[PDB]
């Protein structure tokens, strides 16, 4: 039982008639006593799903219908249950628009479509074609004016042109959408966007033009035309500009196809006020007086409510709205629409800016829209960088699924301001895409469904100290990441925090002393759930050979902590400074003593290493054994023996090329199948050999590396160090 009064929090976009809605709420409060608070937060379509998870979202959310299926699929919307009479009061197509999986998930409010708006004084006869506009602009330019200005930051406004010659979102056939058939990279879409980019190239439009600039331009009479919706008209009236609303220009002898939106009001599933919300929406808003109150503030367009529609249908602006809505298509409401919108937004901005060609932009958008794992990761990125919607990205020209050299399809580069209070410097943040399962169609990775690791289950990241004067992030770390990715795919070994990676060249191909890498959990990036699995984020940390050796001999985690305690060497977020000239040991002499104390008392943390090695003469015992290593692995043999066997621990060399492994074991440890009685044993290519403390000590005495090939022998066994005979191949995760 509830002994309390409810309330209503309402979200509506800032370009809509929210004061009129507040007036309808004021009337609701008068009649009912229930307060109604109308808010118009920025990015409310992105915030709503964020806040609903906290339980702090509104009772009612207004938006175009295309977003609501995603919210619904995510369980964020209450099913709406109007009786037949009320359903009868609104047009069937709009109910259709607000229908998801056989349920009504919102109340439809109004039909929106873009139209050509034009200044009758500057232009008494508006152009019937897009092709006319460049010529018209020159004329208007002669007298200090422009032909057309509109919002190029939202793909919504450019889409009518893109769709004109045959661009589409998802193909509608036999009552449903095909989520893999996307029409953004077809000739018609390329043609439309190419036309837009040509308009910008020839200086008839500017790529940076946004909503407010276009609005100011048209409302001050600085531009002859604009493209906008009904909501925009109230402000034009105020400007006292003599304007007309007409059909959008044709492209290639075809009508522009704007996406038709139905302004809809959904009820939060977590709301304790669903009835008050129903009452408000049905009996107060969706009436002549309510919609009139909202429309007076900012025109809604063609309202779903018949009575007010016949009343507003007289308006030739609404007639024009409906002509353009008619010639266009209603937006799908399927969940994949937000990924699709992100994809198209980036393509239009990048093509218009000249950052990318139309072909590359739309190809990425086409692939991008069909890509859930990517969209999940991008989601995390967006959470981290609200300020940077469009990052600089390194894109693989030929993708890995077609056997291009680079397995990371994309590498995003962000500018991270760090924390000046925390003494964390500014730096560039690289994030990779490809080691996880982006697309889930098994082109590169095996798809097993939700839960478990997505692809290898992680993505690589890197933090590079920003140098003074640097306008953009350097791109070499991307190639570095590609190298690491190539290793991961070929070797089949997943990376873990605490691991090290011997590279043996300065990472940036400079003279830098940073020639090696440690791997740790990214300090900011949180693991993500994708339909294809979970993704964690492994940050790369550049180190000196001395530090690598210390990580090997002692442990990686310790060295990482030391690196955190020394800011110029990493700090809390373990940022890499390629120009760093001293090891942490040169910075604090005594610290080395701490490692040395650690090594002698605790030994090495390294369970094993992947290296060039082999062994030779179904569980099998062997009378003789012959072990083979390369120099580097050979240099770790002393670590294996002294560092672990003498501490009652085991050590494993695993070959990356073959399926072989060699595990050194000492007396005890239970788990070993190698007994002193039978020293050498093998489970296939896995070889386990048991060595005694006495023999370990003796072995340590014998080994002092010398020129190759170098040979060691005993009556039972031989040990070779070789010049990389070890040679000749796995692709993908198939």
């Amino acid at each position: 039982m509830k002994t309390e009064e409810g309330k209503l929090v309402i979200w509506i976009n800032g370009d809509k008639g929210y004061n009129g809605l507040a007036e309808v709420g004021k009337k609701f409060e008068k009649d009912t006593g229930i307060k109604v608070t109308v808010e118009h937060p920025d990015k409310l379509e992105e915030k709503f799903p964020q806040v609903a998870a906290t339980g702090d979202g509104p009772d009612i959310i207004f938006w175009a219908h295309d977003r609501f299926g995603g919210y619904a699929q995510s369980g964020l919307l209450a099913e709406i249950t109007p009786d037949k009479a009320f359903q009868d009061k609104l047009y069937p197509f709009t109910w259709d628009a607000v229908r998801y999986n056989g349920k009504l998930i919102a109340y439809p409010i109004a039909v929106e479509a873009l139209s050509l708006i034009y200044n009758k004084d500057l232009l008494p006869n508006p152009p019937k074609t897009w092709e006319e506009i460049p010529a018209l602009d020159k004329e208007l330019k002669a007298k200090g004016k422009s032909a057309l200005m509109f919002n190029l930051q939202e793909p919504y406004f450019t889409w009518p042109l893109i769709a004109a010659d045959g661009g589409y979102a998802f193909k509608y056939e036999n009552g449903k959408y095909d989520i893999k058939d996307v029409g953004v990279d077809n000739a018609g879409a390329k043609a439309g966007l190419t036309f837009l980019v040509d308009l910008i190239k020839n200086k008839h439009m500017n790529a940076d033009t946004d909503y407010s600039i276009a609005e100011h331009a048209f409302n001050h009479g600085e531009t002859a035309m604009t493209i906008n919706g009904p909501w925009a008209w109230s402000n034009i009236d105020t400007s006292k500009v003599n304007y007309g609303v007409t059909v959008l220009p044709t492209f290639k002898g075809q009508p522009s196809k704007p996406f038709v939106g139905v302004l809809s009001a959904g009820i939060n599933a977590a709301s304790p006020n669903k009835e008050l919300a129903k009452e408000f929406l049905e009996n107060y808003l969706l009436t002549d007086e309510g919609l009139e109150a909202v429309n007076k503030d900012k025109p809604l367009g063609a309202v779903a409510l018949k009575s007010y529609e016949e009343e507003l249908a007289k308006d030739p602006r609404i007639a024009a709205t409906m002509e353009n809505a008619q010639k266009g298509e209603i937006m799908p409401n399927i969940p994949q629409m937000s990924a699709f919108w992100y994809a198209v937004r980036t393509a239009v901005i990048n093509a218009a800016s000249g950052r990318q060609t139309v072909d590359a932009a739309l190809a990425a958008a086409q692939t991008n829209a069909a890509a859930p794992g990517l969209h999940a990761i991008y989601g995390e990125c967006r959470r981290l960088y609200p300020d940077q919607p469009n990052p600089l990205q390194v894109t693989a020209i030929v993708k890995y699924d077609s056997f291009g050299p680079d397995p990371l399809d994309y590498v995003s580069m962000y500018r991270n301001v760090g924390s000046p209070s925390a003494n964390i410097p500014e730096h560039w943040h690289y994030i990779s895409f490809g080691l996880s399962d982006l697309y889930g169609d098994n082109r590169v990775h095996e798809f097993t469904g939700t839960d478990g690791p997505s692809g290898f289950g992680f993505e690589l990241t890197f933090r590079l100290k920003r140098e003074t004067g640097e306008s953009a992030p350097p791109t070499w770390p991307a190639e570095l990441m590609q190298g690491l990715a190539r290793y991961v795919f070929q070797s089949e070994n997943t990376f873990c925090s605490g691991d090290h990676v011997s590279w043996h060249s300065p990472l940036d191909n400079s003279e830098s002393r940073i020639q090696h890498m440690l791997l740790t959990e990214d300090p900011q990036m949180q693991p993500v759930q994708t339909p294809f699995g979970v993704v964690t984020f492994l940050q790369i940390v550049g180190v000196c050979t001395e530090e690598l050796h210390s990580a090997q001999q002692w442990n990686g985690q310790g060295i990482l902590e030391l690196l955190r305690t020394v800011p110029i060497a990493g700090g809390p977020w373990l940022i890499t400074d390629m120009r760093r000239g001293e090891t942490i040991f040169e910075i604090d002499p005594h610290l080395q003593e701490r490692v040395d104390k650690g090594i002698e008392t605790d030994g090495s943390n390294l369970s094993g290493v992947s290296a060039k090695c082999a062994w030779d003469d179904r569980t099998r015992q062997l009378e003789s054994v012959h072990l083979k290593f390369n120099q580097e692995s050979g240099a770790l043999i002393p670590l294996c023996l002294r560092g672990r066997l003498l501490h009652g621990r085991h050590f494993t060399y695993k070959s990356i090329t073959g399926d072989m492994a060699i595990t050194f074991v000492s007396t005890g440890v239970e788990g070993a199948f190698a007994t002193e009685e039978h020293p050498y044993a093998a489970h296939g290519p896995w070889l386990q050999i048991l060595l005694t403390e006495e023999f370990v000590e003796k072995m340590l005495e014998d080994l002092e590396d010398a020129a190759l090939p170098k040979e060691y022998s005993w009556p039972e066994k031989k040990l070779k160090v070789s010049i990389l005979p070890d040679v000749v191949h796995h692709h993908h995760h198939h």
């Binding site: 190298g483 691991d499 090290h500 990676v501 390294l606 369970s607 094993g608 992947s610 580097e632 692995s633």
Partner: peptide, 8 residues
């Protein structure tokens, strides 16, 4: 706890 050598 693991080492990967000469990944290049």
């Amino acid at each position: 706890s693991y080492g990967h050598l000469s990944a290049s």
